Design a protein around this motif. Structure first.
Motif, PDB file in Angstrom:
ATOM      1  N   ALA A  17       0.839  -1.193   0.000  1.00 15.59           N
ATOM      2  CA  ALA A  17       0.000   0.000   0.000  1.00 15.59           C
ATOM      3  C   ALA A  17       0.875   1.244   0.000  1.00 15.59           C
ATOM      4  CB  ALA A  17      -0.914   0.012   1.225  1.00 15.59           C
ATOM      5  N   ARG A  18       0.496   2.206  -0.833  1.00 18.48           N
ATOM      6  CA  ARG A  18       1.239   3.477  -0.943  1.00 18.48           C
ATOM      7  C   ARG A  18       0.283   4.616  -1.253  1.00 18.48           C
ATOM      8  NH1 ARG A  18       4.516   0.091   0.093  1.00 18.48           N
ATOM      9  NH2 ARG A  18       6.450  -0.416  -0.994  1.00 18.48           N
ATOM     10  N   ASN A  19       0.709   5.825  -0.932  1.00 18.85           N
ATOM     11  CA  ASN A  19      -0.075   7.001  -1.252  1.00 18.85           C
ATOM     12  C   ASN A  19       0.765   8.005  -2.005  1.00 18.85           C
ATOM     13  OD1 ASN A  19      -2.828   6.697   0.201  1.00 18.85           O
ATOM     14  ND2 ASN A  19      -1.283   6.078   1.716  1.00 18.85           N
ATOM     15  N   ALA A  62       5.789  -8.339  -6.782  1.00 16.54           N
ATOM     16  CA  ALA A  62       5.290  -7.124  -6.147  1.00 16.54           C
ATOM     17  C   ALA A  62       6.315  -5.997  -6.197  1.00 16.54           C
ATOM     18  CB  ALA A  62       4.908  -7.432  -4.701  1.00 16.54           C
ATOM     19  N   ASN A  63       7.583  -6.303  -5.876  1.00 17.54           N
ATOM     20  CA  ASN A  63       8.634  -5.284  -5.916  1.00 17.54           C
ATOM     21  C   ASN A  63       8.879  -4.805  -7.346  1.00 17.54           C
ATOM     22  OD1 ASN A  63       9.480  -4.715  -3.185  1.00 17.54           O
ATOM     23  ND2 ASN A  63      10.351  -6.806  -3.110  1.00 17.54           N
ATOM     24  N   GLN A  64       8.791  -5.714  -8.311  1.00 15.04           N
ATOM     25  CA  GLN A  64       8.883  -5.323  -9.705  1.00 15.04           C
ATOM     26  C   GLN A  64       7.785  -4.338 -10.081  1.00 15.04           C
ATOM     27  OE1 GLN A  64       9.516  -8.718 -12.010  1.00 15.04           O
ATOM     28  NE2 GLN A  64       9.180  -7.733 -14.008  1.00 15.04           N
ATOM     29  N   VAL A  65       6.556  -4.573  -9.628  1.00 14.07           N
ATOM     30  CA  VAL A  65       5.467  -3.654  -9.962  1.00 14.07           C
ATOM     31  C   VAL A  65       5.630  -2.346  -9.205  1.00 14.07           C
ATOM     32  CG1 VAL A  65       2.972  -3.315  -9.990  1.00 14.07           C
ATOM     33  CG2 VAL A  65       3.916  -5.567 -10.481  1.00 14.07           C
ATOM     34  N   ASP A  66       6.115  -2.430  -7.961  1.00 10.43           N
ATOM     35  CA  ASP A  66       6.353  -1.249  -7.130  1.00 10.43           C
ATOM     36  C   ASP A  66       7.365  -0.303  -7.776  1.00 10.43           C
ATOM     37  OD1 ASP A  66       5.691   0.151  -4.825  1.00 10.43           O
ATOM     38  OD2 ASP A  66       7.427  -0.633  -3.718  1.00 10.43           O
ATOM     39  N   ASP A  67       8.512  -0.843  -8.217  1.00 11.43           N
ATOM     40  CA  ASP A  67       9.523  -0.042  -8.904  1.00 11.43           C
ATOM     41  C   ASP A  67       8.944   0.657 -10.130  1.00 11.43           C
ATOM     42  OD1 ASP A  67      11.321  -0.915  -6.986  1.00 11.43           O
ATOM     43  OD2 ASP A  67      12.169  -2.508  -8.242  1.00 11.43           O
ATOM     44  N   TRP A  68       8.136  -0.069 -10.910  1.00  9.65           N
ATOM     45  CA  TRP A  68       7.538   0.465 -12.128  1.00  9.65           C
ATOM     46  C   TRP A  68       6.680   1.691 -11.836  1.00  9.65           C
ATOM     47  CZ3 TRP A  68       2.552  -0.977 -14.841  1.00  9.65           C
ATOM     48  CH2 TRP A  68       2.605  -0.689 -16.227  1.00  9.65           C
ATOM     49  N   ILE A  69       5.846   1.604 -10.808  1.00 11.08           N
ATOM     50  CA  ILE A  69       4.990   2.720 -10.453  1.00 11.08           C
ATOM     51  C   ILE A  69       5.819   3.853  -9.863  1.00 11.08           C
ATOM     52  CG2 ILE A  69       3.123   3.404  -8.915  1.00 11.08           C
ATOM     53  CD1 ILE A  69       1.998   0.613  -9.174  1.00 11.08           C
ATOM     54  N   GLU A  70       6.836   3.518  -9.055  1.00  9.00           N
ATOM     55  CA  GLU A  70       7.636   4.548  -8.411  1.00  9.00           C
ATOM     56  C   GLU A  70       8.474   5.352  -9.399  1.00  9.00           C
ATOM     57  OE1 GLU A  70      10.151   3.245  -5.204  1.00  9.00           O
ATOM     58  OE2 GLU A  70       9.750   5.085  -4.067  1.00  9.00           O
ATOM     59  N   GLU A  71       8.725   4.831 -10.599  1.00 11.48           N
ATOM     60  CA  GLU A  71       9.400   5.649 -11.597  1.00 11.48           C
ATOM     61  C   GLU A  71       8.607   6.913 -11.896  1.00 11.48           C
ATOM     62  OE1 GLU A  71      10.188   3.201 -14.996  1.00 11.48           O
ATOM     63  OE2 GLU A  71      11.385   1.782 -13.788  1.00 11.48           O
ATOM     64  N   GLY A 111       8.557   5.553   7.493  1.00 14.75           N
ATOM     65  CA  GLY A 111       8.355   4.726   6.321  1.00 14.75           C
ATOM     66  C   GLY A 111       7.216   5.224   5.457  1.00 14.75           C
ATOM     67  N   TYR A 112       6.643   4.297   4.693  1.00 14.20           N
ATOM     68  CA  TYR A 112       5.515   4.658   3.848  1.00 14.20           C
ATOM     69  C   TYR A 112       4.341   5.074   4.718  1.00 14.20           C
ATOM     70  CZ  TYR A 112       8.310   2.708   0.122  1.00 14.20           C
ATOM     71  OH  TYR A 112       9.328   2.464  -0.778  1.00 14.20           O
ATOM     72  N   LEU A 113       3.751   6.210   4.379  1.00 10.57           N
ATOM     73  CA  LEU A 113       2.642   6.751   5.148  1.00 10.57           C
ATOM     74  C   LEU A 113       1.364   6.220   4.528  1.00 10.57           C
ATOM     75  CD1 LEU A 113       4.080  10.366   5.642  1.00 10.57           C
ATOM     76  CD2 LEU A 113       4.283   8.368   7.131  1.00 10.57           C
TER      77      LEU A 113
HETATM   78 MG    MG Z   1       9.482  -0.310  -3.253  1.00  8.01          MG
END
Ligand code: MG
Ligand code: MG
Lengths: 362, 352
Positions: free
Chosen positions: B35-37, B144-153, B164-166
């Protein structure tokens, strides 16, 4: 109480009945019974006090203190010479029927070893009973015939060539023979199979009853119900065949539950031993339940160091008549439960200290 | 319904989820959720319609129709472009949560193979979900980490150096990680052991819940406590407990097969008799019967029937999917008639 009455009410299990008979894990005892009447004497339903007294008197005169080779000396006990608790013990030891205790001129001619019991003035003038431990109907029939021959030497039986021995019960006419077997069937009860078996047994002309004669202690008595027209040999085979089947079915079911639910069964039987060895109150009902469990445990090798003879003795010893006799005088039900618990736990603690201390020496 | 929506609601069991995963007799699936915002955007609790709408437009603009090597193309489904039963099918396929169906600017970025479902505007702006067949939490964590990196770009995550992540929920703060396994535990239920097991699992910082949040002897075991825990601790806490349940359920399965063999064959074959011959059946009895038959396949009692067929029916006979498949709403009584007919046909089909 005569010295011979004391002799018969003293022990719950006679040395004769402590012997190991065949299939004694499933079949506790075999009984053969022959009914006869005196020729020219009205059956007990319509006879006079004088007639009944003569029957007993003729037996005291010619059979009391007399002997049969291979069986022993016979003693005559008159029901009128026995206290109510004395008579109940004789019932609870399976030596006499309850109805004999109500017969005013009832008596029984008993062998000293308690193998033979000739009831007098019950439903017939003479009811010869032979009781063997385990499964031995043919052996019991032979002893029955010895006693029958013995009595006929001095008694003329009510007999006619076209009907056979004449008995009071019209169905009983013919051989006068009834055969019963006492069986311990805990696995067939436990596995919920016995209620689908009993109706089949009743179809074959046999009848099933509890130990008294519900099935407390999982003990069942299977006896001949229909005998009109059957020979002696057919009567005994009809019961033998069914009993032999039940022996096999009860053994298979024991092996089945032992294999599939081993730990649950050990827990069941040792918990029942736990009750018997530590309780301070116990009724006849629960005693019967627990004794059945422990006996099943002994038979299967789960319960160790305890002989089945101790259990057979307790099944009789904990009956309400015998418990009161052994304790001296009548007792409230509550008092019995306290005395019963003490008797069982002490008898059991005694048997495991012999087993502890004689085994230790070796 | 759009051609991309029809694609995700057509099949009850995705080809991805038909793959044999490890320990798949006991573990049906493994799920990883991050989960991220959005940095500088208020949590769904206080965000405005204009804000919520921007989040989903950005995913349409930068991630819709885009691809990840080794995973496949993604497509955006907006909740407001989906009929209620369509939304229900996605919930029953475990692709979205029920709360997403009520979110007006909710959406989900789905991989075409249905391995990845990124929920948009639910309890957090972003919920990356990866669902794998069988017991493979670590492979799901890699994806999951692969998808996370993709979105974080292209997305700046709401992050702080001490915390940490809020996330909106204050106890998810930190990794934003939650792991789950869906487990089939019929023997521990039959042998009356599951109720002495569940309280113990709840002690280990985990939680036990029903299939969608215990019908069919299906249990979902998830991380309940995550605050302060590392990713490595979160995944291992669930993995070790789940691995113990696998062994305990397998031992209990072998045990009852040995203790009550014919009674067990009678139970699972009678449940097959119901499924292959009933003319009415409710959701409850279906799940009861599917569990029995699934156990029979696993123990070798029932032959000629693949467990994949049973997994498909478990979803296909759900009330939402049943109505979608039948083309419109249905009275409960009507569902029971069509459900029985549906089950009967698939089963007759597979035994020829
Ligand atoms: Mg990440
Ligand atoms: Mg004779």
């Amino acid at each position: 109480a005569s010295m011979s009455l004391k002799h018969f009410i003293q022990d719950a299990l006679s040395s004769w009945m402590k012997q190991k008979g065949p299939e004694s894990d499933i079949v506790l005892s075999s009984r053969i019974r022959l009914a006869r009447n005196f020729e020219h004497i009205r059956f007990p339903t319509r006879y006079s006090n004088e007639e009944a007294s003569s029957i007993i008197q003729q037996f005291e005169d010619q059979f009391s203190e007399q002997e049969i080779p291979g069986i022993g000396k016979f003693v005559l006990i008159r029901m009128n010479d026995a206290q109510p608790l004395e008579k109940r013990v004789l019932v609870e030891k399976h030596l006499i029927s309850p109805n004999l205790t109500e017969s005013p001129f009832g008596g029984c001619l008993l062998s000293e070893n308690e193998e033979v019991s000739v009831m007098l003035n019950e439903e017939d003038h003479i009811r010869i009973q032979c009781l063997f431990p385990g499964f031995q109907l043919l052996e019991a029939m032979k002893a029955a015939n010895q006693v029958d021959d013995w009595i006929e030497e001095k008694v003329d039986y009510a007999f006619n060539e076209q009907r056979g021995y004449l008995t009071s019960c019209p169905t009983n006419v013919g051989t006068g023979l009834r055969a019963s077997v006492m069986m311990h069937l805990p696995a067939l009860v436990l596995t919920r199979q016995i209620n689908r078996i009993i109706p089949a047994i009743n179809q074959l002309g046999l009848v099933v009853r509890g130990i008294y004669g519900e099935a407390v202690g999982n003990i069942f008595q299977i006896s001949n119900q229909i005998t009109l027209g059957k020979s002696e040999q057919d009567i005994v085979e009809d019961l033998n065949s069914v009993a032999a089947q039940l022996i096999e079915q009860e053994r298979s079911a024991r092996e089945a539950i032992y294999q599939t639910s081993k730990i649950e069964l050990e827990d069941r039987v040792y918990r029942s031993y736990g009750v018997l060895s530590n309780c301070r109150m116990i009724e006849s009902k629960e005693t019967a339940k627990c004794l059945s469990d422990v006996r099943l445990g002994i038979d299967l090798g789960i319960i160790k160091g305890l002989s089945s003879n101790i259990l057979n003795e307790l099944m009789i010893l904990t009956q309400p008549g015998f418990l009161q006799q052994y304790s001296g005088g009548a007792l409230r039900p509550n008092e019995r439960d306290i005395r019963r618990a003490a008797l069982i736990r002490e008898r059991l603690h005694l048997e495991m200290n012999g087993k502890r201390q004689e085994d230790e020496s070796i």
